[PDB]
Amino acid sequence: FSVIGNPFSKATQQPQIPDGRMLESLPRRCQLVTEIRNNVTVGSNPTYILVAPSLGLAFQAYQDTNVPGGLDSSVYGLQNRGCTVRANLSATSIENYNDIAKWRIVSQGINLKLNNVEDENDGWYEACRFQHDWTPDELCLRSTENDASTISQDEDLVMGVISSSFMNGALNTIGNNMVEQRGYESGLLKNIHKRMFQLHNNTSAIRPKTLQGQFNYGSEITFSGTESEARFTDVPSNRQLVDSLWHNDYDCILIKLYPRENTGAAGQTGSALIVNAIQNLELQYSPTSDLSTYHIANKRARMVEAKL
Amino acid sequence: FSVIGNPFSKATQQPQIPDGRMLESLPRRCQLVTEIRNNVTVGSNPTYILVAPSLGLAFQAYQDTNVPGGLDSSVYGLQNRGCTVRANLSATSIENYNDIAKWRIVSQGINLKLNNVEDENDGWYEACRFQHDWTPDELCLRSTENDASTISQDEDLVMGVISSSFMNGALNTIGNNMVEQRGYESGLLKNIHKRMFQLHNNTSAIRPKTLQGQFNYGSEITFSGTESEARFTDVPSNRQLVDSLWHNDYDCILIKLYPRENTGAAGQTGSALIVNAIQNLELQYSPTSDLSTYHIANKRARMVEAKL
Amino acid sequence: FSVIGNPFSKATQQPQIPDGRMLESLPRRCQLVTEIRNNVTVGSNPTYILVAPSLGLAFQAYQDTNVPGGLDSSVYGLQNRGCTVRANLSATSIENYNDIAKWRIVSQGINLKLNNVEDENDGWYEACRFQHDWTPDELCLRSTENDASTISQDEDLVMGVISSSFMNGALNTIGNNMVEQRGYESGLLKNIHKRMFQLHNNTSAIRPKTLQGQFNYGSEITFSGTESEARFTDVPSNRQLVDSLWHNDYDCILIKLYPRENTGAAGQTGSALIVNAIQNLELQYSPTSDLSTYHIANKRARMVEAKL
Amino acid sequence: HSKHFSVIGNPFSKATQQPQIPDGRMLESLPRRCQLVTEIRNNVTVGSNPTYILVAPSLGLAFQAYQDTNVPGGLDSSVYGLQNRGCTVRANLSATSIENYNDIAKWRIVSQGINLKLNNVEDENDGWYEACRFQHDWTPDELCLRSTENDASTISQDEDLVMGVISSSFMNGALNTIGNNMVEQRGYESGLLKNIHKRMFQLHNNTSAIRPKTLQGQFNYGSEITFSGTESEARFTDVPSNRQLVDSLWHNDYDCILIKLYPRENTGAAGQTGSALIVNAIQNLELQYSPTSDLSTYHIANKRARDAAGEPF
Amino acid sequence: HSKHFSVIGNPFSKATQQPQIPDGRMLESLPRRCQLVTEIRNNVTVGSNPTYILVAPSLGLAFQAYQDTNVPGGLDSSVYGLQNRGCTVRANLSATSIENYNDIAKWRIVSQGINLKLNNVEDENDGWYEACRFQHDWTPDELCLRSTENDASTISQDEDLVMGVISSSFMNGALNTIGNNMVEQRGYESGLLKNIHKRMFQLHNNTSAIRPKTLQGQFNYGSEITFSGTESEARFTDVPSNRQLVDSLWHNDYDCILIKLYPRENTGAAGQTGSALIVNAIQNLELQYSPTSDLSTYHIANKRARDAAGEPF
Amino acid sequence: FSVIGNPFSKATQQPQIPDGRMLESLPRRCQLVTEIRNNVTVGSNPTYILVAPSLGLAFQAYQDTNVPGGLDSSVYGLQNRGCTVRANLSATSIENYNDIAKWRIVSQGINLKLNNVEDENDGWYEACRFQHDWTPDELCLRSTENDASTISQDEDLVMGVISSSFMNGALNTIGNNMVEQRGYESGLLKNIHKRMFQLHNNTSAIRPKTLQGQFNYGSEITFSGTESEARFTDVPSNRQLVDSLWHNDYDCILIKLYPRENTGAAGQTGSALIVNAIQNLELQYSPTSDLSTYHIANKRARMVEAKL
């Protein structure tokens, strides 16, 4: 093993990384397909898609028509496939209810197809991968619902970037220096369909991350009063959380989009993109912790029948 | 291939039947370990352990200390492994809520170990396999809970024999004529730990049974007012239900026990048996019918963001 | 390499892991042999033996006759082999006075032998291994003394589970669902002498845990006023202590016991088990921190003799 | 990969200006050879007490010397750090953080070592030494942050910093204990200073699987880092944040080297001004840089190839 | 020296990653290829008035665009500067100086150019353009300092800066005059935007003896540099200090290129959102660094070797 | 095996003597490095270093600046490495507290380097080995502290020669006839650094010496009232002690030094010598006798918990 493969392989793909670092592991194929469209607010400015090694995040899209309330980006989670954590507000913790003890990524990627008619097929794009020295205050917890309301009890969560990274943070800086980055490419959106974007591991010895059954937090995690987001300060507890849900043995991908403008009128409705995102996981599960559905019967025999 | 294998064998245990009769099937190992003991009312009469090719049933035991309320047999089920149907009383139907489209058995059987002290280790047994021509009025539905209440909404069910079969029905008749039956053996209970009893198929072309998502019934299924059992009359509908939960391509196993008497007193508390039932299944699943815990977002991009 | 070996095997017992991950390491064999018995308060309820990859712990037993004061479990440690840390209460720190810089396990496990007379040799057990996603509030510090006094200065400590885990926590939940777990086995206690239980590593690249010479703690570690136990809250510091005393590259072993009842009377004094725990360690040592018993002469020759 | 193996182990080696460990654990990393030359001379205040040189795997630190003639202000040891070389962090006191201003994402040490040469006239060329390597179990309150400037002023805004040990460790802490019990340490060697130029003291790895340490862009600190009001020193308490910082700046996959020196005394009298050693420390690093960094564009693919204190320099 | 000649004149040239002018005027210098890709689209507020692209020999500036869709706040032009690349100065407002933080001692331009490609659908692919090169006699009050960030905030501490022209120069200053009299300018060319991808616009030198400009570590300024309270812009008066700063940041041995654009109007209506150009600016620099700098160690010996706006891209 | 090797071998050294005379033995590497200097009292007369096969004695140096009180020689012990006995004055015995049952010597030697500036590098030396018929009244017990006070409780002891042997006893006689002895050499001190002096065994069948746990003594051992020394008469008890701590299967080495004079003034401060002494032992250990630190727990289970 040197480099992780391509999730969109017509060939046959290895379910796991064959290195002996996760014995008796199980593979989990997580896939999301949906159409996204650049919103009206962003006007003529470029939009962005970020693919990160974050557990259960299919991708994060800057300024698309799905953005909730006042947040400026959308997240697309894989919470239906059983690879996310949720919010246990009554116990004030991040709950690992899918019983994942250890996880890594076998392959992760994205493929976009322009869904626009022939006389609206303009636009172009730049893409690149990058290894960034993330600080926790650049990251945040987002509800996978991607909705306009506060995070509530048992809400599924993914780790993404604060939306402002795209406009004046790290991702903007990278977004403006794309042509100097590793693995740079550019093209017309009408051609992006023939492009499989895949994450690259930055080491050949990929060690899994560990999750606790409950990850307790104090005031260093600020849950937003109106939006479906929670912010981090940079304190020891939040670094440990970032170390459990973000896999820094993998680089990220940034796609910068220069789409056809969306003014919300016929003929000018943006660049619709069919997005196909896959995150192939390798998991070691802990024992089931919720047996509320199970019938647990006493294994010791009664001395005498309950009849007498 | 010709004959199914031994579920307890530690030698290259096939997860499927390599006959090509179930393409893209999945295996399912369901194991139950528990202790049982003959009760006081049976007295010095024989007791029985039935192992049958019924979906989800580990074994049925006649007159052990666990018999619920006024029933004379105990059912032991594998509901925790998702291989059962449940009572949908509000729709008056048997609900295949685990979405099993088709099933057959790969291997099944029990191993028994005597758990008495050495000065109480008497007793003996007779064992055979057979291919009874079952009629639906000899069978019944039983709540896997094995409790002394009535069958409720969404209660898990297994198909077993009516308890009076062991006393004055087909099983008693077979139990009285064991040497005529195939696979006859006998021995002392203190040596039964050496026997790996296993079901046999009566054909080398085992075709899977089919299940509907709902199996609606009328008055032909009578639910006990007081017991955790529902009875059948011999009518076309009940025959069709029997055909989907009882794989008649396999033979049953009857173990007749002549144990130490349970009178309730010291040194006369019966023969305790540690039972190790296993049912290995080959399943074709049907698509998830219940998505009440899924997140289903519209896959078409909004034309405009919600905040406009 | 792939998997660690059997500590009880009499066949070319490797003293190290031949992976090159601990250069100039030293081996350390730590063995404890003792007898245990279920107590009277547990009554006819199951008891447990936990074997965990905790530094210096032979095993933890739930509800045996040795339980100290008001605790419900007994810890058995290998302090006499110099593989433990101790309480430095006057510095409010956990003291690595044995100068272990880095550690991993080469092999570990237990062998149990029933020590009852033949007319009292009933009982049975279930055993499995698992990879729980431990949280620090499920764990605790325990004085290896296993006595009914409070933790004193320089008292030897091992990390074990809180006793209430066996009753209403993760271990009870695992204990109720053993067949779902890996390595499941069951049997009679009178035959358990034939089983060499052994920990498994969940990765072929076992990286050593690190230890500081002092590990200072604040209020997040609460020392019992009356018991030989200290408890944790789930905070960054406790997580960091857990990471240094509990090697999570290994799985734990739970043995659930259904023994003869101990009522205190003649012939009803429980099931006595002779336990043979072994923990083989690979250690990198740090230079002797305590030279209070050394002779340290000045290495520079005096210019003149003292008598002048 | 031959030149890489020549540099690996042997820091004093002009085989390749791009040394990397070819184990596949840092794909497309960037080599960095940092070299320093200086003079170590025992100062007057240490008298006849032994002096020390510590070589530790700390990032950007060539070595640390106890009671030499460069000790600043009230501190008893000198740090010799590699500054203006792209491998140091700095003190963002305004934001109250330790800033990774070169944006190093991941880093490890390909090799590290020193060579010492006595330069006293032959009528003043006495003194001897012992040396050892060890694998101490560090606690953060034994470590500290030092301005690479090694000057007699408080740490100011944007000051370059390296991790060192607190000076008193040499007097009454871990390093005093190791120095007093040198013979029992691994790789023990002893000799005369007039011959010490024959030796090359290199750090050794304690594992064959050396994993890079990670760094954030900003590492925010609270009151657990106490900046001196007078010295160029910041001290730690043993709390989780300081353990995280030590993990990010002190690579614990390597051992330390300690050299204990019994030099010719420095008194000030005519021929009695100590022992002068010309020192030639080298630290060969492997870095991964974050795209925002200047040195990002110089990344180079690195693909997998298939116990004594001193060696003959 | 063949690859150097290939890059010299022809910035879009993958001949060598180390381009230098082999005239002997910069011994042992360091090449630096800085590249930028962006989109230029005329914004709604300019209406049908012509837009512009200015390519000037300013240090770290790829180009400047008038009334495109990236104009920040109240400014009418956008600067596209090359940041985080080792060739920019920054705003040391605390010390009230312009800081040469990369420590460039001497610098000149080996070559510089742009290529533009229209990306509108064929039913919206109208518009035309004119282009010329010129050798304007600049005055400092026509120039200004712009944060490379091109953002809508005041210039803050440690902000990266490039020299540009004041935005109003396009409306009523020198650049308006040149744009109104393009046909009389040297190298005059005109064409359709759908064909503009065939052209490569490179700067040309006005002398064969190109002498590097010099920079100080700190360039202290008084009240003659007025920082905007709102915009990311600082303006000059025509005083000696500002002339010295302009000399150090604007290389007057090269000519400027001005492209005047008559694009498809951007109104917001469905098919009427302007002309979108994919732009590919490149600036190939020759630097001498001061020893304190990080990039000092990469210096390479450079020993002597022995008129139309566009060329066929 | 014929002759014992050189402890300063750049080559690889045998940890034990491979002859089968000490099965399951353990090797112990004992090393001492220190600077010595001839004192002022001895003036211009020669000084001496003796290396003997005495357990834990690195060497004995006649008239160096470290001599304690009125004794005329210093001893340098290896008591930090666990190969010495101590003084149990309360029980009036020599105590074998390191639990050594049997010991011999694998290799033992010394290497001296002149630490003097260029214009003070004069001096010379003669060296030789000898087999002497020691009488016990030529030997003595010395405190390894080499200090100016009486031997006290638990003082570490080594066996050396009475200091007067050097001036008018056996060693003086040998010291004056060096050039006729076996293995004679002479040279200048400025050259002694390139000389590895090693003991020679006088037999190829080296049998270990035995030590008692306590060696009791009467009045035949006279402890000095002011100095750290105890003298022997020649009686049966003292011969047995000399037979336990002095290994007459090995010869001794005498180095006679003619050093630069030390008058305690600048320019004339003697000949400083860096001494490197190694005594490689082969040991068979008895069981640990002091368990004061151990936690000895009753191995028999309680009938009932201490709680009831």
Coordinates of N, CA and C in Angstrom, one line a residue, chain D residues 28-32 84-88 101-104 287-300, chain E residues 32 84-86 293-298:
Chain D
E28 N 5.8 13.2 -0.2 CA 6.2 14.5 -0.7 C 6.4 15.5 0.4
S29 N 7.5 15.3 1.2 CA 8.0 16.2 2.2 C 9.1 17.0 1.6
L30 N 9.7 17.8 2.5 CA 10.7 18.8 2.1 C 11.9 18.7 3.1
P31 N 13.1 18.4 2.7 CA 14.3 18.3 3.6 C 14.7 19.7 4.0
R32 N 15.4 19.8 5.1 CA 15.9 21.0 5.6 C 17.2 20.7 6.5
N84 N 15.8 32.1 11.7 CA 15.7 32.6 10.3 C 16.0 31.4 9.3
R85 N 15.4 30.2 9.7 CA 15.7 29.1 8.8 C 14.4 28.3 8.5
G86 N 13.2 28.9 8.8 CA 12.0 28.3 8.4 C 11.5 27.1 9.3
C87 N 12.1 26.9 10.5 CA 11.8 25.8 11.3 C 11.6 26.2 12.8
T88 N 11.0 27.4 13.0 CA 10.9 27.9 14.3 C 9.5 28.5 14.5
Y101 N 4.4 30.4 12.3 CA 4.5 31.5 11.3 C 5.0 31.0 10.0
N102 N 5.8 29.9 10.0 CA 6.2 29.2 8.7 C 5.2 28.3 8.2
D103 N 4.1 28.0 9.0 CA 3.1 27.0 8.7 C 3.7 25.7 8.3
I104 N 4.3 25.1 9.3 CA 4.7 23.7 9.3 C 3.5 22.8 9.7
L287 N 10.0 18.2 6.6 CA 8.8 19.0 6.9 C 7.8 18.8 5.8
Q288 N 6.5 18.9 6.2 CA 5.4 19.1 5.3 C 4.9 20.5 5.6
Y289 N 4.8 21.3 4.6 CA 4.3 22.7 4.8 C 2.8 22.8 4.3
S290 N 2.1 23.7 4.9 CA 0.8 24.1 4.5 C 0.8 25.0 3.3
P291 N -0.2 24.9 2.5 CA -0.2 25.6 1.2 C 0.0 27.1 1.3
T292 N -0.5 27.7 2.4 CA -0.3 29.1 2.6 C 1.2 29.5 2.7
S293 N 2.0 28.6 3.1 CA 3.4 28.9 3.3 C 4.2 29.3 2.1
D294 N 5.2 30.0 2.3 CA 6.2 30.4 1.2 C 6.9 29.1 0.7
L295 N 7.4 28.3 1.6 CA 8.2 27.1 1.3 C 7.3 26.0 0.8
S296 N 6.0 26.2 0.6 CA 5.2 25.1 0.1 C 5.6 24.7 -1.3
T297 N 6.0 25.6 -2.2 CA 6.2 25.3 -3.6 C 7.4 24.4 -3.8
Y298 N 8.3 24.2 -2.8 CA 9.5 23.4 -2.9 C 9.3 22.0 -2.4
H299 N 8.1 21.5 -2.3 CA 7.9 20.1 -1.9 C 8.3 19.1 -2.9
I300 N 8.8 18.0 -2.4 CA 9.4 17.0 -3.3 C 8.9 15.6 -2.9
Chain E
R32 N 12.1 33.7 -9.7 CA 10.8 33.5 -9.0 C 9.7 33.6 -10.1
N84 N 1.8 35.7 -0.5 CA 2.4 34.5 0.0 C 3.4 33.8 -1.0
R85 N 4.1 34.7 -1.7 CA 5.1 34.2 -2.7 C 6.5 34.7 -2.5
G86 N 6.7 35.5 -1.4 CA 8.1 36.0 -1.2 C 8.5 37.2 -1.9
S293 N 17.3 36.6 5.3 CA 16.1 36.1 4.7 C 16.1 34.6 4.7
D294 N 14.9 34.0 4.7 CA 14.7 32.5 4.6 C 15.2 32.1 3.2
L295 N 14.8 32.8 2.2 CA 15.1 32.4 0.8 C 16.5 32.8 0.4
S296 N 17.4 33.1 1.3 CA 18.8 33.5 1.0 C 19.5 32.2 0.5
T297 N 19.3 31.1 1.2 CA 20.1 29.9 0.9 C 19.9 29.3 -0.5
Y298 N 18.9 29.8 -1.2 CA 18.6 29.3 -2.6 C 19.2 30.1 -3.7

